[PDB]
Scaffold this active site. Structure first.
Site, PDB file in Angstrom:
ATOM      1  N   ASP A 181       1.453   7.001  -7.413  1.00  0.00           N
ATOM      2  CA  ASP A 181       1.821   6.570  -6.071  1.00  0.00           C
ATOM      3  C   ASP A 181       3.081   7.298  -5.619  1.00  0.00           C
ATOM      4  OD1 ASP A 181       3.164   4.695  -8.077  1.00  0.00           O
ATOM      5  OD2 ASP A 181       4.151   4.051  -6.226  1.00  0.00           O
ATOM      6  N   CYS A 215      -6.953   5.149  -2.139  1.00  0.00           N
ATOM      7  CA  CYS A 215      -5.947   5.114  -3.184  1.00  0.00           C
ATOM      8  C   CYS A 215      -5.529   3.636  -3.253  1.00  0.00           C
ATOM      9  CB  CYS A 215      -4.798   6.096  -2.868  1.00  0.00           C
ATOM     10  SG  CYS A 215      -4.359   6.262  -1.106  1.00  0.00           S
ATOM     11  N   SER A 216      -4.239   3.322  -3.285  1.00  0.00           N
ATOM     12  CA  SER A 216      -3.825   1.916  -3.177  1.00  0.00           C
ATOM     13  C   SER A 216      -3.775   1.465  -1.696  1.00  0.00           C
ATOM     14  CB  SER A 216      -2.498   1.702  -3.898  1.00  0.00           C
ATOM     15  OG  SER A 216      -2.169   0.330  -3.965  1.00  0.00           O
ATOM     16  N   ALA A 217      -3.008   2.173  -0.878  1.00  0.00           N
ATOM     17  CA  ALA A 217      -2.919   1.850   0.565  1.00  0.00           C
ATOM     18  C   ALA A 217      -3.951   2.584   1.414  1.00  0.00           C
ATOM     19  CB  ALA A 217      -1.546   2.158   1.083  1.00  0.00           C
ATOM     20  N   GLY A 218      -4.466   3.686   0.885  1.00  0.00           N
ATOM     21  CA  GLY A 218      -5.411   4.523   1.628  1.00  0.00           C
ATOM     22  C   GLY A 218      -4.732   5.394   2.673  1.00  0.00           C
ATOM     23  N   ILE A 219      -3.474   5.775   2.415  1.00  0.00           N
ATOM     24  CA  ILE A 219      -2.724   6.651   3.355  1.00  0.00           C
ATOM     25  C   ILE A 219      -2.047   7.890   2.709  1.00  0.00           C
ATOM     26  CG2 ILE A 219      -2.533   4.839   5.171  1.00  0.00           C
ATOM     27  CD1 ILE A 219       0.530   4.626   4.443  1.00  0.00           C
ATOM     28  N   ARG A 221      -1.976   9.429  -0.903  1.00  0.00           N
ATOM     29  CA  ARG A 221      -2.839  10.312  -1.677  1.00  0.00           C
ATOM     30  C   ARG A 221      -4.144  10.580  -0.927  1.00  0.00           C
ATOM     31  NH1 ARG A 221      -1.861   6.384  -6.769  1.00  0.00           N
ATOM     32  NH2 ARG A 221      -1.542   5.005  -4.932  1.00  0.00           N
ATOM     33  N   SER A 222      -4.731   9.538  -0.326  1.00  0.00           N
ATOM     34  CA  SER A 222      -5.935   9.704   0.527  1.00  0.00           C
ATOM     35  C   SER A 222      -5.739  10.707   1.653  1.00  0.00           C
ATOM     36  CB  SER A 222      -6.420   8.370   1.104  1.00  0.00           C
ATOM     37  OG  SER A 222      -6.909   7.567   0.051  1.00  0.00           O
ATOM     38  N   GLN A 262       2.408  10.591   2.535  1.00  0.00           N
ATOM     39  CA  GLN A 262       3.583   9.693   2.485  1.00  0.00           C
ATOM     40  C   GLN A 262       4.910  10.297   2.027  1.00  0.00           C
ATOM     41  OE1 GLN A 262       4.253   5.992   3.258  1.00  0.00           O
ATOM     42  NE2 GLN A 262       3.169   7.260   4.788  1.00  0.00           N
TER      43      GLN A 262
HETATM   44  C1  LIG Z   1       8.554  -0.471  -5.127  1.00  0.00           C
HETATM   45  O1  LIG Z   1       7.786  -0.215  -3.940  1.00  0.00           O
HETATM   46  C2  LIG Z   1       6.668  -1.064  -3.535  1.00  0.00           C
HETATM   47  O2  LIG Z   1       6.354  -2.000  -4.257  1.00  0.00           O
HETATM   48  C3  LIG Z   1       5.971  -0.810  -2.210  1.00  0.00           C
HETATM   49  C4  LIG Z   1       5.034  -1.722  -1.705  1.00  0.00           C
HETATM   50  C5  LIG Z   1       4.424  -1.483  -0.469  1.00  0.00           C
HETATM   51  C6  LIG Z   1       4.747  -0.330   0.262  1.00  0.00           C
HETATM   52  C7  LIG Z   1       4.099  -0.100   1.607  1.00  0.00           C
HETATM   53  C8  LIG Z   1       4.762   1.074   2.354  1.00  0.00           C
HETATM   54  C9  LIG Z   1       4.244   1.282   3.778  1.00  0.00           C
HETATM   55  C10 LIG Z   1       4.020   2.505   4.288  1.00  0.00           C
HETATM   56  C11 LIG Z   1       3.531   2.729   5.683  1.00  0.00           C
HETATM   57  C12 LIG Z   1       3.038   1.679   6.470  1.00  0.00           C
HETATM   58  C13 LIG Z   1       2.584   1.919   7.772  1.00  0.00           C
HETATM   59  C14 LIG Z   1       2.642   3.216   8.301  1.00  0.00           C
HETATM   60  C15 LIG Z   1       3.132   4.260   7.520  1.00  0.00           C
HETATM   61  C16 LIG Z   1       3.583   4.012   6.219  1.00  0.00           C
HETATM   62  C17 LIG Z   1       2.584   0.107   1.361  1.00  0.00           C
HETATM   63  C18 LIG Z   1       2.168   1.385   0.658  1.00  0.00           C
HETATM   64  C19 LIG Z   1       1.941   1.397  -0.723  1.00  0.00           C
HETATM   65  C20 LIG Z   1       1.535   2.578  -1.357  1.00  0.00           C
HETATM   66  C21 LIG Z   1       1.313   3.740  -0.622  1.00  0.00           C
HETATM   67  C22 LIG Z   1       0.877   5.018  -1.289  1.00  0.00           C
HETATM   68  F1  LIG Z   1       1.496   6.008  -0.661  1.00  0.00           F
HETATM   69  F2  LIG Z   1       1.306   5.047  -2.544  1.00  0.00           F
HETATM   70  P1  LIG Z   1      -0.963   5.333  -1.283  1.00  0.00           P
HETATM   71  O3  LIG Z   1      -0.966   6.713  -1.873  1.00  0.00           O
HETATM   72  O4  LIG Z   1      -1.633   4.311  -2.142  1.00  0.00           O
HETATM   73  O5  LIG Z   1      -1.360   5.224   0.159  1.00  0.00           O
HETATM   74  C23 LIG Z   1       1.527   3.713   0.761  1.00  0.00           C
HETATM   75  C24 LIG Z   1       1.942   2.551   1.396  1.00  0.00           C
HETATM   76  N1  LIG Z   1       4.319  -1.336   2.449  1.00  0.00           N
HETATM   77  N2  LIG Z   1       3.318  -1.801   3.306  1.00  0.00           N
HETATM   78  N3  LIG Z   1       3.885  -2.918   3.918  1.00  0.00           N
HETATM   79  C25 LIG Z   1       5.152  -3.091   3.465  1.00  0.00           C
HETATM   80  C26 LIG Z   1       6.101  -4.065   3.780  1.00  0.00           C
HETATM   81  C27 LIG Z   1       7.361  -4.046   3.175  1.00  0.00           C
HETATM   82  C28 LIG Z   1       7.667  -3.054   2.239  1.00  0.00           C
HETATM   83  C29 LIG Z   1       6.713  -2.075   1.920  1.00  0.00           C
HETATM   84  C30 LIG Z   1       5.449  -2.088   2.534  1.00  0.00           C
HETATM   85  C31 LIG Z   1       5.682   0.582  -0.247  1.00  0.00           C
HETATM   86  C32 LIG Z   1       6.291   0.337  -1.479  1.00  0.00           C
HETATM   87 CL   LIG Z   2       4.582   7.707   7.739  1.00  0.00          CL
END
Ligand SMILES: COC(=O)c1ccc([C@@](C/C=C/c2ccccc2)(Cc2ccc(C(F)(F)P(=O)(O)O)cc2)n2nnc3ccccc32)cc1
Ligand SMILES: [Cl-]
Length: 285
Positions: A181, A215-219, A221-222, A262
């Site tokens: 991630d 992936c996890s969020a679908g943004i 790595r996806s 990301q």
């Molecule tokens: C220690 O860090 C974490 O636990 C963590 C948890 C969630 C997130 C994301 C962070 C939110 C990002 C975001 C949301 C909206 C628009 C653009 C970016 C969700 C997220 C997780 C993983 C990924 C990834 F890049 F690893 P993927 O490859 O699986 O997609 C992406 C996102 N998120 N979504 N809502 C949130 C509310 C408060 C804080 C963080 C929040 C980021 C870090």
């Molecule tokens: Cl972004």
């Protein structure tokens, strides 16, 4: 004439000047924004893995379901590259049936997974051939038919059965297992091999529904996977490979789902894999 020498020269320039972060931030802040009203309805709170990651209303996949049609999944339609993808989050324990419902309804033949179940994500497919899964809510059965484990990815053959009609389909599962991630793949080569395998399988073909990528969020790595795939198709379809503006392409994709790619590192990796990938396809193939 080595046109790739000119675009690898400026990749080196961005590396030398340390400009990846600024370039990535400039993309983030130019990204479009659309409503996600349906994602944010009370009844759908437990259908979302992450509070801020939502599908835009205009591009969301609808389940064929009267009760509740919502899944956190978006349709990315790339018009010039002539490719569609479905990008979705890692299924939750309650959304696994919706996920396979989506796969069936959209007539996808390939699923691309870029995260691991324990790094999160539910175990949405059977780990054991002899132990099938029934998704009772959506009335579907899933069996693991084969599994071919390599060091950086795993390819699985799955059988998806509609228990209502009794029709079965072969689903190909391409699982890249070493992509952390907010991280990058182990190497450009390993990424490209994985991608070419997906391509060769027929899963991306217009005969089928869109491949499902998650992936996890679908943004993050996806988004990185689809950007690289789309940009390669563009460098091949076009007269001038150096005309492909990866920033413009990413922004275009981001019209269909928020937050695609990301980190600045993931952006840089996508450029690197596209340059390397295009050398390969447009050179001796
Ligand atoms: C220690 O860090 C974490 O636990 C963590 C948890 C969630 C997130 C994301 C962070 C939110 C990002 C975001 C949301 C909206 C628009 C653009 C970016 C969700 C997220 C997780 C993983 C990924 C990834 F890049 F690893 P993927 O490859 O699986 O997609 C992406 C996102 N998120 N979504 N809502 C949130 C509310 C408060 C804080 C963080 C929040 C980021 C870090
Ligand atoms: Cl972004």
């Amino acid at each position: 004439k080595l046109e790739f020498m000119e675009m690898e020269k400026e990749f080196e320039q961005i590396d030398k000047s340390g400009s990846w972060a600024a370039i990535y931030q400039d993309i983030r802040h130019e990204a479009s924004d659309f409503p996600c009203r349906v994602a944010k309805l009370p009844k759908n709170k437990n259908r979302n893995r992450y509070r801020d990651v939502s599908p835009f209303d205009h591009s969301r996949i609808k389940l064929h379901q009267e009760d509740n049609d919502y899944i956190n999944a978006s349709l990315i339609k790339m018009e010039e590259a002539q490719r569609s993808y479905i990008l979705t989050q890692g299924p939750l324990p309650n959304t696994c049936g919706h996920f396979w419902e989506m796969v069936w309804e959209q007539k996808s033949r390939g699923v691309v997974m870029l995260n691991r179940v324990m790094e999160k994500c539910a175990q949405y497919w059977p780990q054991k051939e002899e132990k099938e899964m029934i998704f009772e809510d959506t009335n579907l059965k899933l069996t693991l038919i084969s599994e071919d484990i390599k060091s950086y990815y795993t390819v699985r053959q799955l059988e998806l059965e509609n228990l209502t009609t009794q029709e079965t389909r072969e689903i190909l599962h391409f699982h890249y297992t070493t992509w952390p991630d907010f991280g990058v793949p182990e190497s450009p080569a390993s990424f490209l091999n994985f991608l070419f395998k997906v391509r060769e399988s027929g899963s991306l073909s217009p005969e089928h529904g869109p491949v499902v990528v998650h992936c996890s969020a679908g943004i993050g790595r996806s988004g990185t996977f689809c950007l690289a795939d789309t940009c390669l198709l563009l460098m091949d379809k076009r007269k001038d490979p150096s005309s492909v503006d990866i920033k413009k392409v990413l922004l275009e994709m981001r019209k269909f789902r928020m937050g695609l790619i990301q980190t600045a590192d993931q952006l840089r990796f996508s450029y690197l894999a596209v340059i390397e990938g295009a050398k390969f396809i447009m050179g001796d193939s």
